[PDB]
Design an enzyme around this catalytic site. Structure first.
Site, PDB file in Angstrom:
ATOM      1  N   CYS A 149       0.828  -1.192   0.000  1.00 54.77           N
ATOM      2  CA  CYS A 149       0.000   0.000   0.000  1.00 54.77           C
ATOM      3  C   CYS A 149       0.866   1.248   0.000  1.00 54.77           C
ATOM      4  O   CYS A 149       2.068   1.184   0.258  1.00 54.77           O
ATOM      5  CB  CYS A 149      -0.913   0.008   1.233  1.00 54.77           C
ATOM      6  SG  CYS A 149      -0.069  -0.410   2.778  1.00 54.77           S
ATOM      7  N   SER A 170       5.902   7.532   1.892  1.00 55.57           N
ATOM      8  CA  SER A 170       6.794   8.629   1.563  1.00 55.57           C
ATOM      9  C   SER A 170       5.964   9.901   1.614  1.00 55.57           C
ATOM     10  O   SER A 170       4.760   9.873   1.349  1.00 55.57           O
ATOM     11  CB  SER A 170       7.388   8.430   0.169  1.00 55.57           C
ATOM     12  OG  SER A 170       6.402   8.541  -0.831  1.00 55.57           O
TER      13      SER A 170
END
Lengths: 264, 264
Positions: A149, A170
């Site tokens: 994911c 991120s």
């Protein structure tokens, strides 16, 4: 498929600038990166809409409402004034695991409604430790079998307060993070509203926290700006279904930000 | 399907004791809970095996080696001296998404080998932001369609250093966390070893960080103990495959912990 909360964000930017390491991304330019960060924003009688730069609240509210209706039609968002996209977050949130066809295909009863499941679980067992919803980057889906994911939201309830923790693989600190803080804080306010709970905390956790090189100078300036007290979010109407929410139902009060900052 | 790193753990315990809120778990007793925590442990020329109490390193190394071989046979672990279990982490790590049958069934080429995929991705693209592996609680699998994971590991590489971030849905601070810090720090050392990288940092992130009530008194005492410099982990042999690792290949040096603390 108590110090101003904004100080944490500013501290993180400053830390990446002084300690971040050069690291290239998939495509674009280089970045200064740090792995593993976390910040906590109280949602109690205040909303974490950053003030050291004007955040595009209109886009936040409008994009979120678009995700909730599970619409995968960009034209349905571009019209609202924010500027077939495939299995975007909207389709994933309401029809997880189904099988994407088209933007006009009816997926009623197809796939798992992660969003409703979260709301339902909060009502059936507030102590549950699995009140989790996930989102994938559409481009990863065809790349491999069972791809990881991109982000996950974990909800938590105690003392009639709802908290949410967002974990992102991120985070684009300059352009994405400020926007996402508002987006998920808002989602928490909505869910709390329909489950009869009071907003607690929003925890933002990142993997690769990075600053794009072309954002360094603008962020250095943003850092010189002193945060203004956070505004408040008011829900003018009483809603029972997460799908019944309309933009006109929300009102930001006391928002006094510094000038807009353009991030390429 | 620089301050001693241990101080963060001690600080977290102290914080839960003074600010934690009473919250009941699935089964057992009540807990003092805080939602959203994070700690960073350097793996550079030192190993985060906690010293304020003797951690069961033998069990850590042995359990991890058991997970790596994807064995779902408890007898294969109980014999090693650590004391059909179904689709446990081992089966999930090496045969993700397959379809569990028995502890003697051959799943060669069945399911996604998350662990090898992580190692392979580190070799094919160290900058990749999707170097992620997940684990589920076996009991959740039959509970619902597409159940949420229990933990996830995200790896990160930069400057020839490998870092790992473990996100756990919930963490039993008294009994589970100290053990898991060592377990995943060790996994990072192993992966780094075979990918020719140097261990970087281990980031431990929790959702529901909790202390069981029957652990309060023992933890209050542990808090009075001053941490001793962390030991070092040595890999005596040169290994090329994660499956070729043997317990005899690792050696903890300089471990000087305080007395064992029993946690019910």
């Amino acid at each position: 498929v108590p110090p101003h909360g904004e100080l944490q964000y500013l501290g993180q930017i400053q830390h990446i600038l002084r300690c971040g390491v050069r690291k290239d991304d998939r495509t674009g330019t280089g970045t200064l990166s740090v792995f593993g960060m976390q910040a906590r924003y109280s949602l109690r009688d205040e909303f974490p809409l950053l003030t050291t730069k004007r955040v595009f609240w209109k886009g936040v509210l409008e994009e979120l409402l678009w995700f909730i209706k599970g619409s995968t039609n960009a034209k349905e968002l571009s019209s609202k004034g924010v500027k077939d996209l495939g299995p975007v977050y909207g389709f994933q949130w309401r029809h997880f695991g189904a099988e994407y066809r088209d933007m006009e295909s009816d997926y009623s009863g197809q796939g798992v409604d992660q969003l409703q499941r979260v709301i339902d679980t909060i009502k059936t067992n507030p102590d549950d430790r699995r009140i989790i919803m996930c989102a994938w980057n559409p481009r990863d889906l065809p790349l491999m079998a069972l791809p990881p994911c991109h982000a996950l939201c974990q909800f938590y309830v105690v003392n009639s307060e709802l908290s949410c923790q967002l974990y992102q693989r991120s985070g684009d600190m300059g352009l994405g993070v400020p926007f996402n803080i508002a987006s998920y804080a808002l989602l928490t306010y909505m869910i709390a509203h329909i489950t009869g709970l009071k907003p607690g905390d929003f925890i933002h956790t990142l993997g690769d926290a990075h600053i794009y090189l072309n954002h360094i100078e603008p962020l250095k300036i943003q850092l010189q700006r002193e945060p203004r007290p956070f505004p408040k979010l008011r829900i003018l109407r009483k809603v029972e279904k997460i799908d019944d929410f309309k933009a006109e139902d929300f009102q930001i009060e006391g928002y006094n930000p510094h000038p807009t900052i353009k991030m390429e």
